[PDB]
Amino acid sequence: RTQSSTGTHGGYYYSFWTDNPNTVTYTNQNAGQFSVSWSGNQGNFVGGKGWNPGAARTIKYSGTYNPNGNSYLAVYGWTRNPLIEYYIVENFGTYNPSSGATAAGEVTVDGSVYDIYTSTRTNAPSIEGTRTFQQYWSVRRNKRSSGSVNTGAHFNAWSNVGLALGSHDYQILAVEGYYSSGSATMTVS
Numbered sequence: 001r002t003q004s005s006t007g008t009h010g011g012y013y014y015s016f017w018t019d020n021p022n023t024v025t026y027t028n029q030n031a032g033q034f035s036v037s038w039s040g041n042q043g044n045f046v047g048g049k050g051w052n053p054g055a056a057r058t059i060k061y062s063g064t065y066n067p068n069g070n071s072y073l074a075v076y077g078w079t080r081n082p083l084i085e086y087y088i089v090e091n092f093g094t095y096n097p098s099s100g101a102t103a104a105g106e107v108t109v110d111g112s113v114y115d116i117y118t119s120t121r122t123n124a125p126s127i128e129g130t131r132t133f134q135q136y137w138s139v140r141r142n143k144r145s146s147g148s149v150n151t152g153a154h155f156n157a158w159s160n161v162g163l164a165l166g167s168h169d170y171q172i173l174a175v176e177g178y179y180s181s182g183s184a185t186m187t188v189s
Contacts, residue, residue: 009049012188015172016047024177032188033063038177041069046076046176049188054079054171056152060189061173065145067093069180075149077171082163083126083133088114088154091143093180098137107157109150112142118162127169134163 005016009028016026016036020043027035034049050059054077065073074097075088089097101117108114117137123130136158155165173188 012049013052013170013172014047014049015170015174016045018045018047019043020045029185033185035183035185036175036177037183039181041179041181044176044178046174048076048172048174048186050075050077050170050172052170054151054168056155057171059149059151059171059173060147061149061186062146063184063186065091065175065182065184065186067177067180067182067184069093069182070095070178071180071182072097072176073145073184073186074174074176075151075171076174078127078169079166080128080169081166083128083131084136084163084165085121085126085133086136086154086158086165087138088149088151089137089139090147090149091140091145093182095178096139097176098139101135101137104161105157107138107153109153110148112140112144114138114140114154116157116161118158136161 003021010031023040023043024038024045072092101119104116119135
C-alpha cells in the first residue's frame with residue numbers, strides 16, 4: 001500500500017510519497033505552505049513543496065518542525081545528465097541521514113558550517129528508473145527550522161568534489177520520517 005502524489009498547488013510544485021498512508025497525513029495549503037503529521041512510529045514518507053525544474057536559487061522557508069525520532073528537514077532534489085540526488089539537510093532527529101556517506105569537506109554558508117558528503121547508489125530507484133548515480137549531501141551543523149538556503153553555494157562546493165550537477169529536475173523543501181512520529185508546517189518561497 002504505497003501512495004505518491006505530485007502536482008502544482010498554490011503556484012508551487014509538490015511531492016508526497018509514503019509506504020503507509022494510514023499513519024501519515026499530508027496537507028497542501030495556500031501558496032508554498034504544507035503540513036504533515038505522522039504517528040504510530042510506522043512507515044516511511046517524504047513530502048514537501050518547491051519547484052520543478054529546480055535551479056540555483058535562494059530558498060526561503062519558515063515554520064515549525066517537531067519530530068519525535070527518525071526524521072529530517074532538507075532541501076532535496078535531482079538533476080539529470082548526469083543523474084544526481086542531493087540533500088541540503090537543515091535539521092534532523094535522532095539519526096544523521098548522511099551516515100555511511102564519505103566525508104568530503106566543509107562549506108560555510110547561511111550562518112553555519114555544513115559538512116559535505118558524497119556517496120554512490122548502485123542500481124537503486126531513481127527518477128530515471130533503476131540506476132547507478134551519485135549523491136551529494138550538505139549537513140548543517142547548526143540545526144534550524146527557518147531561514148534561507150543559497151543553493152548555488154552548495155552546488156559550487158559539490159562541483160569541487162566530484163561530478164558537476166546536471167540539468168535540474170525537481171527541488172523541494174522536504175520533511176521526511178522513518179518509523180517515527182511528529183508534525184510540521186512549513187512555508188517555502
